[model samples]
Target: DCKRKVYENYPVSKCQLANQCNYDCKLDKHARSGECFYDEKRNLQCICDYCEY
Candidate 1:
């Protein structure tokens, strides 16, 4: 459910590896909105919002 219900500090990526690093490696359990994604370099998109790190 990657809906744009809220504004993020940064854009979420579409990479699998990035998702893992962003969510799987983070401290998020339930997200009201938004997601974790990274760039081509597998860099996780760090945003200052939500249950995500």
Candidate 2:
């Protein structure tokens, strides 16, 4: 829900993919938060803090 919440707050369009490798996609401060969580099923999950990357 963090990713979804971030998208809702900042939106995907506002985010910038800052990676050339696979699964390295990232977002900007306005579009995402740096906070994240660790899940056994999903690995590292976003928490939608104030800086996502």
Candidate 3:
């Protein structure tokens, strides 16, 4: 069988780049519950709910 992965969004402090990707994310749980990709400048795109991105 084949499976596909999905991405979602979480209730973080709002990913505000503010013209600069300098926001940190501290995961309260594993990447399954909440996941994100942070750049070198602390820029993060996270997901909490699997239904929403």
Candidate 4:
């Protein structure tokens, strides 16, 4: 069977580099990648991509 990957965001801190965001996500979630993006509240969040299934 084939599977798909999904991405989700989590509030980490203010605007920062992807490395910093990746570090945090890696430590806690074993995420594959991390990116910083603004949310509805106008705060930069860490969006981590990882295998969902």
Model 4 CA lDDT for position 28? 72
Which residue runs of candidate 1 sit more than 4 Å off their true CA positions? 1-32, 47-53
Best by lDDT: 4
lDDT of 2 by residue, 1-53 (tens): 23433223333332343231112223444433244444466544443443334
Better of 1 and 3 by TM-score: 1
Candidate structures ordered by TM-score, highest first: 4, 2, 1, 3
Q: How many clashing residue pairs, candidate 3?
A: 5
lDDT of 4 by residue, 1-53 (tens): 22222233454553356677767666675676755676677765676555555
Q: lDDT by residue for model 1 over 1-53, one digit each (tens)?
A: 13222223343443234454335323453343334544467655543233423
| Per-candidate alpha-carbon RMSD to the true structure | 8.6, 9.2, 10.5, 5.2
Against the correct fold, how does model 3 do in TM-score? Answer: 0.20
Q: How do all models score by TM-score?
A: 0.22, 0.23, 0.20, 0.54
Worst 10 residues of 1 by lDDT: 1-10
Candidate 3 structure quality by residue, lDDT tens digits, 1-53? 22222233433344444222122222332222333456466656653322224
Per-candidate local distance difference test: 0.39, 0.35, 0.35, 0.57
lDDT score, candidate 2: 0.35
